[PDB]
Ligand binder design. Structure first.
Ligand code: ATP
Ligand code: ATP
Ligand code: MG
Ligand code: MG
Lengths: 559, 563
């Protein structure tokens, strides 16, 4: 999953590995030259033969650091471009999955997927292969050079190396499970924070700050973070101390000064250890700190690829106008939990169909099935003869318009929430749609007119934003219109006015109306009563009243 | 760094002082241990190499002291980081419910979400990850320069000149990438908000075909975020180049002075060979500060967001309490005037609701009746005038006793993600199961339990999205009815409920045995059947008032509204 996701970055990462091998050899280059030059100096060689090489080696110090800085600046560009393409792919995929995915997952998890998981790949791209190649090359090369130089001090050099390896292994084992649990806690905390901000009236009226589940999750997450990061940071700091240049220098001198003072080691043979032996500790520390980043990146890549491999709302190849036909439709939000049970319904042009019934009967899920937010488990739905599973999203949603029960405004102007379907619509079209929905008068009273933003907190009343959504659907101007519990928050005057406007605009169109106020659907050509996910009676208002079924009971209950 | 110190607990400042002292001590010990090699090799390469034992002992002492001080500094940094995390996050949790509702603009909501989103380990380990290595690398070459003055004054002066060049490069690099990093952070926050909207508003975006990246607002935000990020990457190029040039200049000064001293005979060849290692130690922090300097702007922005959340203006909160124990208070508005910004919602609305009786508020949309319920509930406060609960100004009421005095059914019911039973228990988490069952029966939530497969343990989505509109409305009604508060504000509780459930819920709202002063907002006449009094709110004025039958007979705006 991670390998299949990061396959496009094969050759940039291989190039990074090779270039970092060359760069770490360049880092080790001036110190070898200076070791040789100092050996020749202390051997009595003429300085005339060593000025040029000496200045060359002294100026070469830190050249590899500059080359590594340039390589990281390039690989940051590579990672940024890859993350942009990856987020584009993620947003493309999410645009086609069924909405059961969104409802079961939430918005905080989607935010984590798009932003944090792609950002979690930063170390795996920009630093992982450089750090690995550097820590394999520079430590091994330096240890080989020091062992062929003098094995005795190389052995004490091996002590902090093995200690560091043990610390790295135990840290990785200890914190591996915590890193696996980390993104789940992150998305849970994000969801709780989003609910805390969104559900502020509920928090304030019921319980306040003290009783909120947000505080409980916050405390639990902070406990998780403390337990995760205390041993992890302790191991990180101990690994830093073990591999620090000060520690290597001290160990070198502890092993060498007794050897130099005795007639065992020449003092000139400590120069390789003094110059080179202190340089490869940070290279090891890089991978030691990077193994957590590798785990985070691999887990995030697996999550991203898992979301990118999911089934979506594909378009079939199977391949009267204005007609919508539900043909033995059945649907289950969960396995074995039906919400629709073999519903057969035909919506025809020039007619108004009323879908009534108890709450939770399945009216909104039926309207969603018409939208193909989810695929029908059985049966088929066909608009203008074409099965909606064969129509693309552009072909489908150009045929059917929707006024959802939950009026979901977007962060933007009132002229953008209206004309969301047709953003390039003229402002006069927006004004006409608003007048039809009776929200033009309200928008005129706003401070900046039709450009007033409708973000979080800068909202309207419920009926007003419902009218805004009605204006959106009006300006879409589709052959088929679906009204999922529209005008629920509208007062009788506003409800009557928008009903008259919709009747004027949909005289020849196919209208599906979902309503609980049965007095608003008395003129429907075909009233359909949906109870427990199955149609129990169909007819006109008078026929359903005379039948004495569920519609008669609902009508009696509402008076 | 003043922004970080401002967020530390006042009870955790001794730890800050100890951490600063130990950081300075660690830098001093590292510099001394680096420079002590010069005497060490001078004695080791001398004609009597036994003289290196003393410098080896001093090196060992400084190294062990460095290990001890560094472990203690790491401990203190971890403690300070997690203490700052806990205090800031808990203060934001405690403050945000008290923050005024007008403060929650989309920008402020984004800032609050980003501040809460910093709870992760990035900000928790800030002191160990950024401040400790940054300070150590910044002050290490300065300390090495000071330490070298005991070896040779001009050598130490050259080292300090390199340090001055390093600090100048640091300041210039910080200044160059300031605007680019700020714009990058802004675009990243906008992209996060648009992703959240994209996931929340997926139905409407798909129906409007604003879902693909080429047509969606989230796609435009992604494009802007990528552009700002690439501009930030480009503007960090001169910073890295300047750090590299500062390193080159420092190396030139250090090595040139060392070679000049060696040529003049004021510095032995073994001392110069030791100074090669000291130069390597001195040049390492030049790269470290270059690598760590970019993270300052992101950290600064994060701490700024946290502090901005903590600086939000909270509502007034007195200390009065309602004298009577659980009795129904008398709600009244006295010249209450309210306005969302420049739009006047209420102007001169005055009424007095009797205690224990049920009242109805009705009228056209945008008239200002949900605003009346919010003022009664304390969600809003008047611009002028006083809302009185039993003769006590709601502004002066204790917030703990203010929320305990009112329960509300909101116009747009919102349920937290979790089981259905958890949301009903928000009204009273410690209520007995009999009380919860009674609340569910009154709200007809019990008809969900036998129909839904998982019963009251069924997992609701974000909001009430995994339930129908009527189902989540009934859950909200049960939540409101479980709370024992003596004031019940009903706001469009019957909007999404069929006639049977609407009638049952209305009769349960009336037949709730608890003595309550009930205020009801509805757009269906059958929802206010049992209301004793009616308020006709239109354009921020109670134009008509009285009983249902009296106003129907009078033929006022009530009958016209229901005509
Ligand atoms: N958050 C807000 N920011 C700005 N104006 C607001 C906000 N909420 C409501 N308003 C405005 O306040 C006025 C009254 O709003 P309110 O919520 O009281 O309506 P209402 O009478 O309950 O309407 P409805 O019957 O449609 O539910 C309206 O003009 C609305 O635009
Ligand atoms: N996203 C979802 N995931 C799981 N179950 C769902 C989801 N949305 C709705 N349901 C369930 O589907 C069943 C029918 O709900 P639906 O919204 O289709 O009914 P409705 O007739 O529109 O109701 P109402 O009158 O309350 O608006 C209910 O049991 C609800 O719990
Ligand atoms: Mg519905
Ligand atoms: Mg309202």
């Amino acid at each position: 999953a991670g390998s299949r996701l990061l396959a496009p970055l094969k050759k940039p990462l291989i190039v990074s590995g090779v270039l970092q091998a060359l760069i770490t050899l360049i880092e080790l280059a001036p110190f070898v030259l200076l070791v040789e030059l100092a050996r020749l100096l202390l051997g009595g060689a003429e300085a005339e033969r060593l000025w040029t090489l000496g200045l060359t080696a002294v100026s070469l110090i830190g050249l590899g650091a500059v080359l590594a800085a340039a390589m990281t600046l390039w690989l940051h560009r590579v990672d940024a471009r890859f993350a942009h393409e990856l987020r584009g792919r993620l947003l493309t995929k999410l645009s086609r999955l069924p909405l059961g995915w969104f409802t079961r997952r939430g918005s905080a998890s989607t935010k984590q997927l798009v932003q944090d998981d792609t950002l979690a790949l930063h170390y795996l791209i920009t630093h992982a292969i450089p750090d690995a190649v550097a820590a394999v090359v520079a430590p091994v090369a330096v240890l080989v050079y020091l062992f062929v130089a003098d094995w005795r001090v190389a052995l004490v050099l091996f002590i902090p190396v093995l200690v560091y390896l043990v610390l790295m292994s135990v840290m990785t084992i200890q914190s591996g499970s915590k890193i696996a649990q980390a993104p789940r806690w992150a998305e849970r905390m994000g969801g709780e924070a989003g609910a805390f901000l969104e559900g502020q009236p509920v928090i304030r009226i019921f319980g306040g700050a003290a009783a909120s589940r947000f505080r409980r999750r916050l405390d639990d997450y902070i406990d998780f973070l403390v337990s995760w990061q205390r041993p992890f940071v302790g191991k990180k700091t101990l690994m830093d101390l073990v591999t620090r240049p000060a520690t290597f220098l001290w160990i070198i001198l502890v092993a060498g000064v007794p050897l130099v003072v005795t007639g065992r080691m020449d003092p000139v043979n400590l120069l390789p250890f003094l110059l080179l032996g202190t340089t490869f500790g940070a290279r090891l520390l890089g991978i030691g700190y990077g193994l957590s980043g590798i785990q985070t990146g691999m887990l995030a890549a697996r999550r991203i690829q898992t979301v990118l491999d999911e089934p979506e709302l594909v378009v079939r190849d199977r391949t009267r106008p204005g007609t919508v036909e539900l043909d033995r439709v059945s649907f289950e939000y969960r396995p074995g939990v039906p919400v629709i049970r073999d519903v057969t319904l035909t919506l025809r042009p020039g007619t108004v169909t009323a879908l009534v019934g108890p709450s939770g009967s399945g009216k909104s899920t039926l309207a969603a099935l018409v939208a193909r937010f989810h695929d029908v488990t059985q049966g088929a739905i066909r608009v203008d003869g074409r099965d909606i599973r064969t129509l693309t999203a552009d072909e489908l949603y150009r045929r059917v318009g929707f006024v959802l029960q939950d009026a979901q405004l977007v962060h933007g102007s009132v002229a953008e929430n209206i004309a969301l379907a047709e953003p390039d619509a003229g402002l006069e079209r927006i004004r006409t749609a608003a007048r039809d929905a009776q929200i033009h008068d309200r928008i005129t009273r706003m401070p900046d007119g039709y450009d007033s933003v409708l973000g979080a907190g800068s909202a309207l009343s419920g009926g007003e934003r419902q009218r805004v959504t009605i204006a959106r659907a009006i300006l879409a101007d589709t052959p088929v219109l679906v009204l999922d519990q529209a005008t629920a928050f509208a007062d009788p005057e506003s409800e009557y006015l928008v009903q008259q406007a919709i009747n004027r605009l949909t005289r020849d169109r196919t209208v599906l109306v979902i309503a609980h106020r049965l007095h608003t659907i008395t003129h429907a050509d075909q009233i359909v009563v949906l109870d427990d996910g199955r149609i129990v009676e169909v007819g006109t208002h008078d026929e359903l009243l005379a039948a004495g079924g569920r519609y008669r009971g609902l009508w009696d209950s509402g008076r | 760094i003043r922004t970080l110190l401002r967020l530390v607990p006042a009870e955790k400042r001794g730890a800050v002082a100890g951490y600063a002292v130990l950081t300075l001590l660690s830098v001093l010990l590292r510099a001394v241990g680096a420079v002590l090699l010069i005497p060490l090799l001078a004695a080791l390469f001398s004609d009597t190499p036994s003289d290196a034992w003393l410098w080896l002992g001093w090196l060992t002492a400084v190294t062990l002291a460095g290990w001890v001080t560094d472990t203690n500094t790491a401990r203190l940094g971890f403690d300070l980081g997690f203490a700052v995390l806990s205090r800031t996050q808990h203060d934001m949790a405690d403050r945000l419910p008290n923050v005024a509702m007008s403060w929650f603009t989309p920008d402020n909501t984004a800032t609050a979400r980003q501040a809460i989103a910093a709870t992760g380990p990035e900000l928790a380990g800030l002191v160990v990850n950024l401040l400790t290595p940054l300070i150590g690398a910044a002050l290490l070459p300065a300390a090495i320069g000071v330490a070298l003055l005991f070896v040779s004054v001009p050598l130490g002066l050259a080292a300090l000149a390199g340090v001055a060049v390093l600090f100048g490069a640091l300041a210039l690099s910080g200044r160059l990438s300031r605007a680019a990093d700020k714009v990058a952070g802004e675009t990243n926050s906008a992209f996060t908000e648009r992703i959240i909207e994209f996931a929340r508003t997926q139905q409407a975006l798909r129906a409007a075909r604003r879902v693909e990246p080429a047509r969606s607002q989230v796609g435009s935000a992604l494009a802007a975020q990528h552009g700002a990020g690439l501009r930030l990457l480009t503007m960090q190029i001169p910073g890295q180049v300047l750090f590299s040039l500062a390193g080159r200049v420092a190396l030139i000064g250090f090595a040139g002075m060392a070679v000049w001293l060696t040529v003049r005979g004021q510095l032995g060849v073994p001392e110069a060979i030791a100074l090669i290692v000291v130069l390597v130690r001195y040049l390492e922090p030049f790269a470290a500060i270059a690598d760590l300097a970019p993270a300052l702007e992101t950290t600064r922005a994060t701490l700024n967001r946290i502090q901005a959340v903590l600086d939000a203006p909270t509502l007034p909160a007195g200390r009065r309490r309602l004298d009577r124990t659980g009795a129904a208070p008398s709600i009244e508005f006295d010249d209450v005037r309210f306005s969302y910004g420049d739009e006047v919602v209420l102007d001169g609305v005055s009424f007095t609701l009797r205690p224990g009786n049920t009242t109805a508020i009705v009228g056209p949309s945008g008239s200002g009746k949900t605003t009346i319920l919010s003022l009664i509930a304390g969600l809003q406060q008047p611009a002028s005038g006083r809302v009185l609960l039993d003769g006590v100004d709601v502004t002066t009421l204790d917030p703990e006793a203010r929320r305990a005095a009112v329960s509300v059914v909101f116009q747009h019911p919102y349920l937290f993600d979790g089981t259905l039973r958890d949301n009903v228990l928000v009204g009273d988490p410690e209520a007995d199961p009999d009380d919860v069952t009674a609340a569910m029966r009154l709200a007809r939530v019990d008809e969900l339990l036998d129909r839904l497969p998982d019963g009251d343990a069924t997992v609701v989505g974000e909001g009430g999205t995994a339930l129908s509109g009527g189902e989540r409305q009934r859950v909200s009604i049960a939540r409101a009815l479980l709370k024992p508060a003596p004031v019940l504000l009903v706001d469009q509780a019957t909007s999404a409920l069929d006639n049977a459930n609407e009638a049952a819920v209305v009769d349960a709202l009336t037949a709730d045995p608890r003595p309550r002063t009930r205020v009801i907002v509805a757009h269906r006449l059958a929802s206010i059947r049992h209301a004793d009094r009616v308020l006709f709110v239109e354009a921020g004025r109670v134009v008509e008032d009285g009983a249902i039958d009296e106003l129907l007979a009078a033929g006022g705006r009530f009958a016209q509204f229901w005509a």
